Amino acid sequence: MLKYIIPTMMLMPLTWLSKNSMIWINTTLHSLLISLTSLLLLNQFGDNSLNFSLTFFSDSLSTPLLILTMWLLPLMLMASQHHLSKENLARKKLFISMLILLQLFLIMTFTATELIFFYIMFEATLVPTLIIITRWGNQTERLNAGLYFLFYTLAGSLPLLVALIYIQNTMGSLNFLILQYWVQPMPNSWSNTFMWLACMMAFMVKMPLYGLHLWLPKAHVEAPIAGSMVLAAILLKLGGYGMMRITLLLNPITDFMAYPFIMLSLWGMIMTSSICLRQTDLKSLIAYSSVSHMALVIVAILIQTPWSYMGATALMIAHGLTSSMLFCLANSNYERVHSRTMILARGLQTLLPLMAAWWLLASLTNLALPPSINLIGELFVVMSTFSWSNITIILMGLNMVITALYSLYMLITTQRGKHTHHINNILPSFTRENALMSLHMLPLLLLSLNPKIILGPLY
Amino acid sequence: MNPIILIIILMTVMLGTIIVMISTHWLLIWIGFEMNMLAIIPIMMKKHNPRATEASTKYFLTQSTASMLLMMAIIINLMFSGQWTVMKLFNPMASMLMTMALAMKLGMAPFHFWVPEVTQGIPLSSGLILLTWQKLAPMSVLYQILPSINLDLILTLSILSITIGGWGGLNQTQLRKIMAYSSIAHMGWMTAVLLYNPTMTLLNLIIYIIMTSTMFTLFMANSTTTTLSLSHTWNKAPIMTILVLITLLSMGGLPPLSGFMPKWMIIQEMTKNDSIILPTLMAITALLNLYFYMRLTYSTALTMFPSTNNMKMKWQFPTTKRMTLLPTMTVLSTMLLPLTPILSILE
Amino acid sequence: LQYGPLAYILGEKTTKKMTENSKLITVDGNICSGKSKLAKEVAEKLGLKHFPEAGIHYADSTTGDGKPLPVRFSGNCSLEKFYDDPKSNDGNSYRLQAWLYASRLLQYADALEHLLSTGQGVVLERSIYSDFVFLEAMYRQGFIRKQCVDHYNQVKKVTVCEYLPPHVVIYVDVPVSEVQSRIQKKGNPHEMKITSAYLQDIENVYKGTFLPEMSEKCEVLQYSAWEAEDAEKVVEDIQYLKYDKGPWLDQDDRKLHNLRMLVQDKLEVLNYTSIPVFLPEVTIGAHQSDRVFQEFTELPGRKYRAGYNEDVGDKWIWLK
Amino acid sequence: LRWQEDPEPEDENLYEKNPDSHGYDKDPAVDVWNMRVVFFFGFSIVLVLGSTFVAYLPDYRMQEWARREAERLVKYREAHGLPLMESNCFDPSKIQLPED
């Protein structure tokens, strides 16, 4: 995986030696080249993962998250270069360096063969994200949002550190490839109950679990646009990736440890979706919708059936692209009206028709319109949860009502109705902005042609 | 002070600590501690104001009481063993008295009550000596008597130090008291792994000395003793805000920094010995240390507090202070975690 | 550095050059006392180095190319706007006063550095011991607030205590009427707006607070407007002083070494001019500070340390 | 009053100084070349050649093989009268059960 680590590190002298007008173009160009190179990871096999070395390996779970991670960096550079135009040159290079460092930490988070190196990268991703939120966020509450984002995560993750070192001392290894073959069943005891909580609660915070999600409608809201893109599209998915790696070791106790948390998501996705019906802040609506979508991934990983893991990894990739595009649309209106209040700028289809078409497409992917991979992941999770217990379709189907009802309300409040009279700085859609919307939406639509690459290791 | 006299007195401080490190007789251990205290008293009274005299009086009283308890532990060892070898002690009463005396010298809780006072009362260089060099000799004596140290006492002192150094720094704005409560918490972390693996004790001591030396060197280079004067650094020297950012994120133990290195290794040695509750509660308590580190980074690096007008004069003058080993100590206190298996050199 | 503890060990004692003519002399007087020539006159009879009275751009003269910086980078304050609007809203009065105090502190550090490095005495014009006499004269006119006087007193209390007072304070008696006559003969359109009460308050804090407190810690000399015109009488009075007061007498090589290590570290000298006391006359917000700092870095010879600027033609930078 | 603060700067319109702006940069040559870099290396390179690469993956996770291999095995066991699949994955001769 060193053929992706070294170009990502060479992005640092590429941005610190570029000319002062050239640091966006060069980083965008070569991060798109790294994203083009990322497709070589699709050398996957039906039985064996692509096992590079003692340190790095990539199965069909890590591979779509790697492609999405390496694709998200140029899109974040395009999204973030407008509001940092008057920024100091060295602080601009520090911002780009934090994004590059975050990509570097993520692409060897997903390919970490051994789990304590997974933990070190998984918690190394906090520091650039924390710095981006608390340094280039816009409002006063970015500092409190950074504190919440840091301290839910560490309070979750330090028992994970203790539990992973315990697995190291007991099983002798934390290689995932070794632990595929040396995994011992985990019986019913209180020691194994807190073993399960220590192995799971960090990823429960990072998904986020409902009830532990409180960091997110601050951290996703107070961040700048590149911070919201990487938090929604990649950094929530570290929790689901780590759950799919760690629930190998947690059988068969998971079959009765999952019961509270499944409830916490199956009711919680009803609640947060309902919360999206009454959000006045558009960016907070997208944050609570991210919680609502990741609750299904939490249920699908806890019920641990093949259809559930396939729908969970499809829904993770699909939600990455969809929520990243939704935050970019919300920023494209924030760069004009300078307020995140959704009721302020109305009737924008009269003023920006092509941008309203992008709003329509991202809303339809948010509400899981078939045959998008949003609907593929949504549908496979609903199939597996119906096979889990037949009553859950109620909480699924009711969810799919409310998920429509905030997605089109977001489409109706912002784009439809009479336009606001006193707002007159509504510029036409820049080419950078429409390029950003298309570079989100067009891969999300092309993946419906060949969805088998985003369906995990057990397609 | 006469610079020759300063050199001779600092060589006498170093001579006392080295005599503690190399001697095989308990009287020379006690002599090295006496020489160390006697020579470090003028370093604390370098500026001659009543706070330095108060700090030196408090330091003298605590170290003198610890020296008397140390000599009583030595004399009870001579009772029950008839010899003087600096090794294990041959009585649990002498072991308890020596562990109490060394906890008083290190300023571990509940004998911590002198450390945030004295460090506040003295300059930054003497506070650097007190929080880095003055730990080396008692940790050497604790290194050599660990077959006799009571487990319950050393872990009680450790967790009480970690919790009290966590809660003490949350209420502070003075930087020296922040470094002092950081000292109390880190000495708790060092003594919690002493009876399990003392190589990790030496590792934690070395990484702590590097990070504390970096933070005191930054505070000397910017001439800041308070939080709110440290927050003027971005308008005076923007690189120093980056350095205090990465060093304070290291001292909280965030990966991938090197200050994550000791405590992780400490947990790596405490779970082998079937202790799971204790390093977990220690690691959760270290979030308090990380919280007031994050408070300092929000004041200094990640925001811009309002400055004054006279700062514009200081823009025309570069720093003439000898920032000794500051790039070296900054690199070592941040980017050393990929070299974590170097710790075997401390075995 | 050039001087340090090692130079003190290797024989450079400062009393080997401290001769009888190594006297720090300060000339004081009201706004048009005519003392500005007298200072130079004393400095051309005793062989002393004359420092002109530090304006806003003294630090601009000591650093860089020596040319005055634009007013947003140095000062952020106008003496002429103080003469026009003394009770201004933006607080130019106390901002000008605090900048002038920091400028006089830098000048006094330079003067002690020259005295302790060469053994040549320095004639100053209105040193830091005689700066508060303007502050009170502003405060008694309602030009500044009480909180500004509190900020000034905190800065002065933690700064002036680290220095030695001058040997000689030469005061010039010129009354308010003759001061106004010389202001009107000067013809400066801003300076002619100075009120009678402000000049009278300058004279009152001179004669009632400054000169009594310097009468213990040095030897004050006081001349009228016409007996200050004869410089040789003043130099005769200076050369026959029997110096028996002030803390210059208990100064060995160690204390003066500590003082020389102080007055060559200019950021250490200017440490407490920017104390974090948030006062609206001196507090600059983060955006203005960021903008003015990034503009100051782009000035020629100002981006790097002084020997490291190719844009002014520094060579051998890759070996320095 | 309050301190010395720069006022809120007005928002720039990129179309005023450059009505042909693509919204990347205020320098029009830098703006147009940033447009060309994004459109070429994003759409002409990663999207088109990327979808061509994904469209011709060499039997991604050996599914097609597993079809054709199954077409062997069924043809072997429709012909030899065998059942299409055993209920036991492993041979019951090579399994020791715990006795009771």
Partner: peptide, 19 residues
């Protein structure tokens, strides 16, 4: 519209004897 940076009210919280 520009980035929030701390005021005097934020900064005086960090300037007392204690926190």
């Amino acid at each position: 519209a520009r980035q929030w940076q701390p005021d005097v009210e934020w900064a005086e919280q960090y300037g007392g004897a204690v926190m």
